[PDB]
């Protein structure tokens, strides 16, 4: 028996997958499962998402993409954070699509002697982060077009989460036209992350790549989509102490993902009732006040930090002055992952 | 090659152990290696510490305790965060000391059908968290003393006042002995109290932080050597103006909090470059100005540690403590030993 765990509801994930598949329509559905499926356990999550419609998967690193192939994912897989200094050839060998994020990346790929290399051009559409920018488009498209063994499956841009969006699309379309003018068909393109996907059907293109929504969380406040949250972070009270007040100790500290800054900003839920966190969050635990403990909370009681039978990830996120993306990624350390 | 890693200096840890072993004198040295040895990798760290003098090891959970036995640690082991509902019996069968942190824990142990159970009494000396409080002294000591299959090896408490907690701890110790509990080996010193209160060493000291080379009291040195370095390789350098920015392969899913925005910089070739903009899930951006030093993709960016700001400095910049920063590197971060 574990005192600290995250409950991962796989059925909720399948549901979310079905809801996203219906919403995508004719567009392909790429499931973004980087960061170990947003901390939900990609080894279990990805197969469920695959079994319910996902046309492809998107991850950040070479290692994550390779892990997907390891568990048996046979769908198209895209990786966008790697450098020519790494063994990217190992990914190519595993049928992993690689994003061209800079001229140097394009160069390393063209100079790679492999039969057929699938690549997707990451376009810097204005954020000035990663990706090939306007001044480099000409050279890169020309170089990739001249490479026999390279197949440019398309291009994509990451609508940084923002007006801003439409300005990015204009630049992206300028790049796509320039690419095709160079002989690059760019058959499958995508720009939609969860927020854009759930609000801009005009930007579906040939493929959409939402991440957050698969885990049942809403990207924009005020919007309903019938999603089912999949993660619940909960601990079992280790000790109930009487000071006629009482406090309870819950076996979770900053070493487990509970920020020290969360002090005095939230409550956990025991049997559906809230109890405010009090005092300093320590390395292995934090304390909550039971008041006169009228409901008779005892050691062993289940305390929901966020999730089922408690406050959802979004509420907890706002209490912590952050976003739900970060809260689901927080549970770590002694926290054990349990499915459904 | 990995774009994001923690470099763990095992020789530094051996060094820190020797230092702490010296300062401990006749007092037993129990190294705290809970939380995977403060995120330094207990499977490699604990053996080094044991090989250099540690008399015992302290961890929080049964699983962490069992993990020490699994790696072959033969020293005394104490575990202080568990409940009667867990299979603590399996831990007793592997010679793992259990802390009595409430009357119910004492009850469970007393009712456990085992021949010899080594226990340490966790004393609530005023903090009012876990541990047995003064109102419970009597009942617990008297019950444990009447159970011959249990060996009360001693008692301990945790410092937040300090002297105040000590006064209380002493009272409990006296009552326990009055009840027939000898309490041969007691302890209260964590890293800060150990380095400054030689009068509180007692029979055993319980340092954690110091073994990893970090100083608890920002004021003076003790000759420790920091053991961890968190660093990344620039993935791309982009022109934004004639200014440039560089993308660093680490986000809040890897341990870099979104709140860290505008609070820090990374060190590249000994010089600092400010993080700017929003911290995303997989990466953050730094400002290079006109990039006078020609930083290129592939460059080594030290977040904290060797060739960068030490953990304490980084912790202050992010409004936290060094204990938390060494626990932060996670996600795609790959641990490497040097
Ligand atoms: C994280 C990420 C996504 C997923 O975004 P959500 O907002 O979670 O839908 C999509 N594309 C890229 C390039 C990403 O890094
Ligand atoms: C974490 C812990 C320690 C170690 O403390 P440092 O401040 O790192 O030396 C000692 N005792 C207990 C009970 C602990 O939980």
UniProtKB/Swiss-Prot annotation, chain B:
EC number(s) from the headed UniProt entry: 5.1.1.1
Organism field: Corynebacterium glutamicum (strain ATCC 13032 / DSM 20300 / JCM 1318 / BCRC 11384 / CCUG 27702 / LMG 3730 / NBRC 12168 / NCIMB 10025 / NRRL B-2784 / 534)
Protein name per UniProt: Alanine racemase
Record's keyword terms, sorted: Isomerase, Pyridoxal phosphate
SMART domains in UniProt: Ala_racemase_C (SM01005)
NCBIfam families: alr (TIGR00492)
Catalytic center residues: 34 (proton acceptor)
MF terms in GO: alanine racemase activity; pyridoxal phosphate binding
Chemical reaction(s) catalysed: L-alanine = D-alanine
Subunit note: Homodimer.
Pathway entry: Amino-acid biosynthesis; D-alanine biosynthesis; D-alanine from L-alanine: step 1/1
Function: Catalyzes the interconversion of L-alanine and D-alanine. May also act on other amino acids.
Top-level taxon: Bacteria
Any one of the GO BP annotations: D-alanine biosynthetic process
Cofactor: pyridoxal 5'-phosphate
UniProt-listed Pfam families: Ala_racemase_C, Ala_racemase_N
Residues the record lists as N6-(pyridoxal phosphate)lysine modifications: 34
Similarity comment: Belongs to the alanine racemase family.
């Amino acid at each position: 028996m574990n005192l600290l765990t995250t409950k991962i509801d796989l059925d909720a994930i399948a549901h979310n997958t079905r809801v996203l598949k219906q919403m995508a329509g004719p567009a392909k559905l790429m499931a973004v499962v980087k960061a170990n499926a947003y901390n939900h356990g990609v080894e279990k999550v990805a197969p469920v998402i695959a079994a319910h419609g996902a046309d492809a998967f998107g991850v950040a690193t070479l290692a994550e993409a390779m892990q997907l192939r390891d568990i048996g994912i046979s769908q198209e897989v895209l990786c966008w954070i790697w450098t020519p200094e790494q063994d990217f050839r190992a990914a190519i060998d595993r049928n992993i699509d690689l994003a061209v994020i800079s001229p140097a990346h394009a160069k390393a790929l063209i100079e790679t002697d492999a039969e057929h290399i699938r690549v997707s051009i990451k376009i810097d559409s204005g954020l000035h982060r990663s990706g090939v920018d306007e001044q480099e488009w000409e050279g890169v498209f020309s170089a990739l077009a001249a490479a026999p063994h390279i197949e440019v499956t398309g291009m994509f841009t990451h609508l940084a989460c923002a007006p801003e969006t439409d300005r990015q699309i204009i630049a992206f379309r300028r790049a796509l036209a320039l690419a095709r003018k160079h002989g690059l068909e760019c058959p499958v393109n995508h720009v939609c992350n969860s927020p854009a996907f759930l609000t801009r059907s005009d930007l579906h293109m040939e493929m959409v790549r939402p991440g957050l929504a698969f885990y049942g969380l809403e990207p924009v406040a005020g919007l309903e989509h019938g999603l089912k949250p999949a993660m619940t972070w909960e601990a079992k009270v280790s000790v109930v102490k009487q000071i006629r007040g009482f406090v309870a100790v819950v076996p979770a500290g900053y070493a487990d993902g509970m920020p020290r800054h969360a002090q005095g900003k939230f409550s956990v839920t025991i049997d559906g009732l809230d109890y405010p966190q009090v005092g300093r969050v320590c390395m292995d635990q934090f304390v909550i006040s039971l008041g006169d403990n009228p409901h008779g909370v005892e050691a062993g009681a289940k305390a929901v930090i966020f999730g089922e039978n408690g406050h959802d990830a979004t509420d907890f996120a706002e209490r912590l002055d952050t976003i739900n993306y970060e809260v689901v990624c927080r549970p770590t350390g002694r926290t054990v992952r349990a499915y459904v």
